[PDB]
């Protein structure tokens, strides 16, 4: 994965996180669980919904075959007609298929990038208050209850 996060340094997905595509699992003294990051989720949904909309639109101009008949002694121009309509279907089929191949790759890297970004956001914000375990996780040096964990989730962790 281009951006190293998904199936990379975070070895797997979380079955437990049923609320968004990216987020947090926090594990402390008062128990644990998951919390989807609404912002990145909502940016990702938008980006993907436009992508698909854009994929549907731009492939709507497409060639429409028209049936056309030619008699026993008009073989050449019927065959012209054949090779021509088959030619456009091949161009549009090549086109549609290859675009899907390409943009599927860009979507997977998109998600990968979204996760790397979120990590980096959290990571900086946890300057030297935590051991970056190198597996998606940061271990604090100090205790960090639900008021504090949400601090990071908030974007407003930063002990000012």
């Amino acid at each position: 994965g281009l951006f190293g996060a998904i199936a990379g340094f975070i070895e797997g997905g979380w079955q437990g996180m049923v609320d968004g595509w990216y987020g947090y699992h926090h594990s402390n003294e008062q128990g644990s669980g998951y919390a989807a990051d609404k912002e990145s989720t909502q940016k990702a949904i938008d980006g993907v919904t436009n992508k698909v909309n854009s994929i549907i639109d731009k492939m709507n101009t497409q060639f429409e075959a028209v049936g056309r008949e030619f008699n026993n002694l008009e073989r050449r121009i019927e065959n012209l007609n054949k090779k021509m309509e088959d030619g456009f279907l091949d161009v549009w089929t090549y086109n549609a298929e290859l675009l899907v191949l390409m943009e599927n790759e860009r979507t997977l890297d998109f998600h990968d990038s979204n996760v790397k970004n979120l990590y980096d956001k959290v990571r900086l914000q946890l300057r030297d208050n935590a051991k970056e375990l190198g597996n998606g996780c940061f271990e604090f040096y100090h205790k960090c209850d639900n008021e504090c964990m949400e601090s990071v989730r908030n974007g407003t962790y930063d002990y000012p």
Binding site: A7, Y22, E29, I55, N60, G67, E74, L89, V100, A130
Partner: protein
Amino acid sequence: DQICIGYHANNSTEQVDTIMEKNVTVTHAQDILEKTHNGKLCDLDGVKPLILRDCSVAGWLLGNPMCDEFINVPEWSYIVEKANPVNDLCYPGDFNDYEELKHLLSRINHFEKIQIIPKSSWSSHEASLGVSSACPYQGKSSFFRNVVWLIKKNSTYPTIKRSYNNTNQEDLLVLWGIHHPNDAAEQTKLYQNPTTYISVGTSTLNQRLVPRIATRSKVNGQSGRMEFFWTILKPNDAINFESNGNFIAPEYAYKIVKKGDSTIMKSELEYGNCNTKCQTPMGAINSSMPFHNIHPLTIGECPKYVKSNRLVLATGLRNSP
């Protein structure tokens, strides 16, 4: 105390292709290609097709006497014709410029037919005697219902000079024919006159047909040939016929209701009692899918046709086990 960044997984078994990896499992895919139809021919916005069953376009326009289901047919969305209809030209021959006709037919939804030259109205020539066993109806010899096979009256064929002016405001499709007999005497038996011709005029038509006596293949027990012709008579303009033998007369013409937007498709399929906003020669399509792989040829509000067996989009991320 630990905080972790991570991402959604779930029980999706869904797969998408990329360039570097095939069959990648995603939490969320979108299959954008329609592969299902209903296998039926259906109305098109509640507007039934002309399903010519066993009748060919020619066998309909000339009124092959076996094509009495189509004497005057309602407006149609599309026409449906078999590969090899058995009811074409009952009397063997040729429809001239047949395909170029079909083409117009393909941009026409409605014909209202009307009488141009009455079967009563042939003073000097007989015309109830132009019937062939090759064109049977109900057992009895017959012929194309919309044109008239004028024969000699009392061993004389006086030069025909008839004429029609178009005082409907729709383009009129006008059909006639010539008979090329097989032998020197058949000519004489049927029309008397030895050397003949048919001469057709319009503002843009300058035509002189002349029969073609030759020895050829029995086909539908027939050794002669009809050879049919057509024209579009602009509205407020006259066609001018003239013949001293071999003339198949127009009796009926077709009034064009150029409604527009049609097709003749090839389908060994029967009518299916359904509606649809998209139809293919193979059956009808019902989807919001941007694409389908049913059939190139379609009429109506339709997905784009492609040759793919499969087209699916990632929306979600790589679904990890």
